[PDB]
A paper describes a structure:
The human diphtheria toxin-like ARTD family contains PARP and tankyrase (TNKS) enzymes that can catalyze both mono-ADP-ribosylation (MAR, mono-ARTs) as well as generate elongated and branched chains of poly-ADP-ribose (PAR, poly-ARTs).
We previously screened a compound library from the open chemical repository of the National Cancer Institute, which led to the identification of the potent and selective PARP10 inhibitor OUL35.27 From the same screening, a TBT derivative OUL40 (NSC295701) emerged, showing an IC50 = 3.2 μM against PARP10. This led us to hypothesize that 1 could be a new nicotinamide mimicking compound with the potential to inhibit multiple PARPs. With X-ray crystallography, we confirmed the binding of 1 into the nicotinamide binding pocket of TNKS2, PARP14, and PARP15 active sites. The inhibitor binding mode is highly similar in all three enzymes, where two hydrogen bonds are generated between N1 and N2 of the triazole ring with glycine and serine residues, respectively.
Residue numbers in the entry:
A (entry chain B): 481 to 678
B (entry chain A): 482 to 678
């Protein structure tokens, strides 16, 4: 079941679809971005239609919904990256083995921001040769989360006496989360690519 | 959920001890004894992990479509320490969990063609009581190439398309003895053999 609102991809498995401003789908992403990035301007927003990534992500979403007690397991988050990474993320998603060490490390995993502003820093969304910055808008299975720790390679157990019964993700602060870290493949779907400039 | 699994009372995870001398136990024992006939089998357990199985079959179906054929699966061995057994049973193989074992063909999970390679103490580390642990694993080796140190994913098939990757890497493409996979849910742990020297 690929979402019915996607463009027909004609038996092909990947497509980047450029959105039209004035449509709700474009305007809602612009507003979530501009709420903390008013100093920047969007060149374009592309919807990522990746059938394999969607299938694997929605399988993990279904399992986390079954495992957790009627939780909102999914957040819409931002990820700034450099241009060299964009073809790889587009095709293969977020690979923790490729992840930057974050300035404040709450674990060795893939980082995702509540605020576009955080992802808009040049450290993440490194401007390319043409001054273009790249930011993903990402469905993330944050699930049940705890404050992380720089040493984590997996999320911590909820209970030290049950080592395999893990939290889903970790955050910088559980009362005001600004960051989430995930430690497993297909726990994040890159849904949109915002291309933007100063 | 495979026919040869036994009922789980609507539960998602069960380890099920095989009966000695029945067909399923005999098949798995023979794979091990081919190179480990000098070892002693305490027991074999079928890992029934619905979640792991479902993500693996999804990845299998994707690879069968992409490779345009259905010879992507191999049966391989993985030795591990007793303290890693609960994690593998519940969450499968994880490339970020890898201490002072060699990663000379890349930073992925290592699987052996021969049980005797997994039977080494450096991999199947004997516990206090001399008990060693080896998994029989369904691995999506798909299309493979020679590996090398420092790989985080397998190499591209053609560098004119950097994103079309090989499925796995090996030590030797003519006569492979190990495979490394770089993604979660490319490996399903199907049996656990508890044994001693
Ligand atoms: C280089 C290397 C590293 C780990 C490893 C092998 C070979 S064969 C095997 N069976 N379980 C673990 N491993």
């Amino acid at each position: 079941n690929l979402p019915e609102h996607w463009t027909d991809m004609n038996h092909q498995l990947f497509c980047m679809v450029q959105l039209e401003p004035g449509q709700s789908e474009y305007n809602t992403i612009k507003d979530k971005f501009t709420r903390t990035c008013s100093s920047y301007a969007i060149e374009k927003i592309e919807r990522i239609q990746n059938a394999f990534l969607w299938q694997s992500y929605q399988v993990k979403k279904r399992q986390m919904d079954i495992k957790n007690d009627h939780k909102n397991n999914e957040r819409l988050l931002f990820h700034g990256t450099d241009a060299d990474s964009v073809p790889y993320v587009n095709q293969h998603g977020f690979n923790r083995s490729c992840a930057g060490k974050n300035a404040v490390s709450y674990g060795k995993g893939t980082y995702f921001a509540v605020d576009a502003s955080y992802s808009a820093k040049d450290t993440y969304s490194k401007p390319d040769s043409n001054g273009r910055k790249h930011m993903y808008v990402v469905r993330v299975l944050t699930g049940v989360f705890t404050k992380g720790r720089a040493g984590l390679v997996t999320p911590p157990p909820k209970n030290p006496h049950n080592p395999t019964d893990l939290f889903d993700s970790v955050t910088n602060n559980t009362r005001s989360p600004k960051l989430f870290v995930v430690f497993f493949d297909n726990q994040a779907y890159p849904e949109y690519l915002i291309t933007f400039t100063a």
